[PDB]
Design a protein around this nucleic acid. Structure first.
Lengths: 208, 100, 99, 84, 62
RNA sequence: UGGAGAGUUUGAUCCUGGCUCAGGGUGAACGCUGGCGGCGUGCCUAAGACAUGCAAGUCGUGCGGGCCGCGGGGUUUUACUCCGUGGUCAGCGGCGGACGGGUGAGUAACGCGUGGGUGACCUACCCGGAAGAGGGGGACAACCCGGGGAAACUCGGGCUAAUCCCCCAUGUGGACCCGCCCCUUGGGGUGUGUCCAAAGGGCUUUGCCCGCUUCCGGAUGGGCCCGCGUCCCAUCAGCUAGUUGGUGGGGUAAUGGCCCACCAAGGCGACGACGGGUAGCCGGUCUGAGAGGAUGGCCGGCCACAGGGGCACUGAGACACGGGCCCCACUCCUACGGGAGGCAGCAGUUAGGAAUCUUCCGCAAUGGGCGCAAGCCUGACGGAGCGACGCCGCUUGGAGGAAGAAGCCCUUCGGGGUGUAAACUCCUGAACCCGGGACGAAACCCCCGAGGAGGGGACUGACGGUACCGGGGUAAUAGCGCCGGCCAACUCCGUGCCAGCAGCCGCGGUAAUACGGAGGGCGCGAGCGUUACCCGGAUUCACUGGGCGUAAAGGGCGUGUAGGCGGCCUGGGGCGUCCCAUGUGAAA
């Protein structure tokens, strides 16, 4: 269970537009702008003071919304991040963002999350000679994100590669659309992924 | 290796063997404070050379008899009346108690 | 049900026989020895020393008696005998004993 | 007596035979008197081979009988050498 | 031994697999009941207590 | 690189302080749902009981026949035997059974973890050095004659071989006696006297292969002992006579009351004896910031047991799971005279319980054993299956798409809300179809170098057409608790202290956001809920880290034992402190 179905229903849940559902959830509303109130029945019925612990866990939720993952593996990821010596927070953020599918997303081959996964976990992607599926494969500072050879002469392939020619994606990602490659360069950061996330409160829900 | 230790001679009494009250000491495994711990051992003597008190340095040896582990070696001191007096007070107080 | 572990204990019975035989033979050999030495004899007593010592070699040879134990019994034997000869006498012909 | 033997490890379908000196008593996984190498029968990674001829020679000289895949180990790693 | 709650049956056997818990009465209450054990399969119709109150996952015809 | 509290005593405050949960966790369990794979884990209780198949053998390079074999010699030929001689049951013999397997029953214990003495030992198949391999005589199988018994198999008897067995030897030598020299716990030499050694088999035979003899150092594990640590009760205080000691014997591989003889009165204790209850121990494992507290299953070493026992035997070693002897206990075969047995081994059966599997497969890897090897077993191991029982990766779609459909809940009838969710178009293609396809495997073995270095031949895969590769390829499982405050998320009928929910205040007595139903929404999601059991929170048995005037708590107050901690100065000693070097602490 990785959720799925009505996704940008959770876009307006927090009211902070979460692209996530492709071109529609990008241009005129992320199932958001139209009715950007937290759904259900109430919504337009006045909320509370979200107890500090609760909304700290809510920026935690928000965090995992920005990925489209289950809380389990994601949890384990947090352990692995907070432990091995580093600046735990930034480490955590960029780390989670080093997940294979999202690489292939922010890179440009995907428009968001579910699609990213679908075609990454498809085996339609190849890294350094070997073609691989698993989205939760967090790559390393020095890899090559290429895409398959029967995945060249194909459709929505040409779509995502169409809209991308003439765009700018992250620095630590090298874009070579003449030869279907993507260099997984330097480690990103908090200022490489500056977005509606406060890693602090997240961490401390996790760091109970 | 063949460890050795001290000891105040306790009691000839037995033939061709004497008992000895040894010393050991050690801290506490959570509470600090070093504490005292006496220990009686079989001090061996083929020729009754150590009398009431005689402190000596005693030794690991081949099991020569029954609980008669250890032996001795060389002498340290004599006139050990007061210390072993308080020992005889240990036995004294042992008889200073009963539950009948 | 069936297995050549009966083999094992068949042979083992045989070894029991071996042991008990040679063993008790040695016992009484040693005993006529201690008698003769006890009274005070020499010659034939130290002859018993001879044959018995040979025997205790066959003992330190096969799986009846053995090395340390064989030399244990032998030592106790030839030592013992020396004690009681001298007890009111002096041996003339040795054997297992020197001088 | 003392011998010179191999001992599988790893997990399921990824064995790797550890070169240990052990008397014929100590069972496979059981224990080792000393490890002095590794032979990987499947070949995977340049970790798949190493022996130490020094201790091998030690045990050999003072008395220790190797096995047969160990005979392979000497056949290749030339622990059976003598030079000249 | 109490019960899990509504739906009264259990003639004399049922096997109240004891589970365990007091309430502010019947001096003790400890060691409850399960239903569906060897008998007593919950209460007729349910929606949430179906983790002890039997009635599996009751699906209609649509 | 490491720490959060919350409700709970009142009319309100603040402390004292037990309760409770938010939390991590398992070899689990149950209820609800149930797709794939890898890797694990799977009687925690009856140490009750067991049907049938398999669990330890090999060796004809140790030795003689029966009998299945063949050339067929003898027999003029016959009967047939027997000279040569594969196979197969045995015998004598050689070696393993003391390794691999397991459970907590025992075990307050040098048994275990640990640091060492061994001048108190032992050690074979293995390495190194040595002196050697003359000769004799016998014995019982196999076999043949005959009795018993349903079976068990027992019984008198006459033969055959040997590496079986003993006898004089030969002495590199070891043993003892005493003599003497070094040592200083039975450690080392020498002399005098006696002691004993041997096995041959194979062949290409005059050399080699597998092996006999007696001793010295080592490679390996175990023995005994020592230092220290190893729970709950004081409502278990005195204890004990082999008991503390000694001389002389027996014992054993070794000292030792382990035992005997004899004699002297000691040995343990409030530093917890003696007594009883509970538990086999650890490397490590969960948890707290740590201190610690608890825990000991697969795995690694150490122990104990073979339904309880007692016991020797045998051996290098055992008091020996598939060796034995007697009582016991229980089950079974029986012709009721006789007799047989040990799944705490691998599968399962029954009981018991809340719950703990498949009587599948290969010796192909690797390991034990025996053989010179080829080899034969191996329920070790190496692999398949079942269970979300634990962990990790995972698909059930993407994308577009209404100021927003039917259906459904509220409603102030304005609308709201469900839900871009589906429908409606495109793409991508779980499983499913085909064809292909292993890693695990190169040594042993055959051959030249000498059999050394090495060099070439070549065998061997249970798992399994499985892993996977390439082609074809369908939108393809979704449930679980909660929704008062803790603790994040509420409107609507129901019901009227009735049914009910409950870890804590407790909630409902006609108008319940707490119970049931629903719309929706919170957390999670191949899982979720529920109880069971362990640390923290608990600074709520506190060393860090409290206390004690009224909250629980100064012994009524004096006394001295022992005990605990002790003024100022100088110097001598180095146990605690301390530091360096170091040994170990394995691996996991």
């Amino acid at each position: 269970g990785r959720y799925i179905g009505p996704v940008c229903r959770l876009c307006r849940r927090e009211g902070v537009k979460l692209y996530l559902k492709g071109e529609r959830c990008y241009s005129p509303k992320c199932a958001m702008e139209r009715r950007p109130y937290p759904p259900g029945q109430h919504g337009q019925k006045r909320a509370r003071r979200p107890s500090d612990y609760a909304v700290r866990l809510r920026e935690k939720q928000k965090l995992r919304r920005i990925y489209g993952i289950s809380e389990r593996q994601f949890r384990n990821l947090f352990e692995e991040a907070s432990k091995k010596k580093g600046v735990t927070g930034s480490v955590f953020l960029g780390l989670l963002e080093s997940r294979l599918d999202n690489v292939v997303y922010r890179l440009g081959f995907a428009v968001s999350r579910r699609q990213a996964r679908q075609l990454v976990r498809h085996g339609h992607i190849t890294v350094n000679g070997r073609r691989v599926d698993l989205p939760s494969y967090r790559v390393r500072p020095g890899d090559e994100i290429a895409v398959a050879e029967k995945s060249r002469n194909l459709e929505l392939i040409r779509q995502n590669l169409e809209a991308m020619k003439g765009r700018k994606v992250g620095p630590w990602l090298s874009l070579d659309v003449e030869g279907m490659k993507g260099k997984f360069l330097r480690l990103p950061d908090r200022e490489d992924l500056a977005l509606p996330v406060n890693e602090q409160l997240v961490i401390e829900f996790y760091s109970r | 290796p063949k460890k050795v230790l001290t000891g105040v001679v306790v009691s000839d009494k037995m033939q061709k063997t004497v008992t000895v009250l040894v010393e050991r000491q050690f801290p506490h495994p959570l509470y600090g404070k070093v504490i005292k711990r006496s220990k009686k051992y079989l001090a061996h003597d083929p020729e009754e050379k150590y009398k009431l008190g005689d402190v000596v340095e005693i030794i690991e040896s081949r099991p020569i008899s029954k609980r008669k582990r250890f032996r001795v070696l060389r002498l340290v001191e004599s006139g050990r009346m007061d210390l072993v007096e308080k020992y005889l007070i240990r036995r004294q107080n042992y008889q200073s108690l009963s539950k009948r | 049900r069936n297995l050549s572990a009966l083999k094992r204990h068949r042979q083992s019975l045989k070894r029991r026989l071996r042991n008990k035989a040679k063993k008790s033979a040695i016992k009484t050999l040693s005993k006529k020895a201690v008698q003769l030495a006890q009274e005070g004899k020499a010659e034939e007593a130290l002859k018993i020393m001879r044959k018995a010592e040979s025997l205790i070699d066959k003992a330190a040879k096969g799986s009846t008696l053995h090395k340390n134990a064989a030399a244990r019994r032998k030592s106790r034997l030839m030592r013992k005998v020396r004690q009681l000869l001298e007890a009111a006498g002096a041996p003339l012909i040795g054997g297992g004993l020197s001088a | 007596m003392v011998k010179i033997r191999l001992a599988r490890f790893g997990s399921k379908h990824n064995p790797h035979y550890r070169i240990v000196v052990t008397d014929a008593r100590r069972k496979r996984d059981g224990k080792y008197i000393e490890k002095i190498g590794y032979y990987d029968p499947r070949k995977t990674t340049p970790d798949w081979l190493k022996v130490d001829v020094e201790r091998a020679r030690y045990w050999l000289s003072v008395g220790a009988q190797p096995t047969d895949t160990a005979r392979r180990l000497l056949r290749q790693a030339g622990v059976f050498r003598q030079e000249a | 031994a109490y019960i899990p709650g509504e739906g009264h049956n259990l003639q004399e056997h049922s096997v109240v697999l004891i589970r365990g818990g007091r309430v502010k009465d019947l001096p003790g209450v400890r060691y409850h009941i399960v239903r569906g054990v060897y008998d007593a399969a919950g209460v007729k119709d349910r929606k949430k207590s179906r983790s002890k109150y039997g009635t599996k996952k009751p699906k209609e015809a649509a």
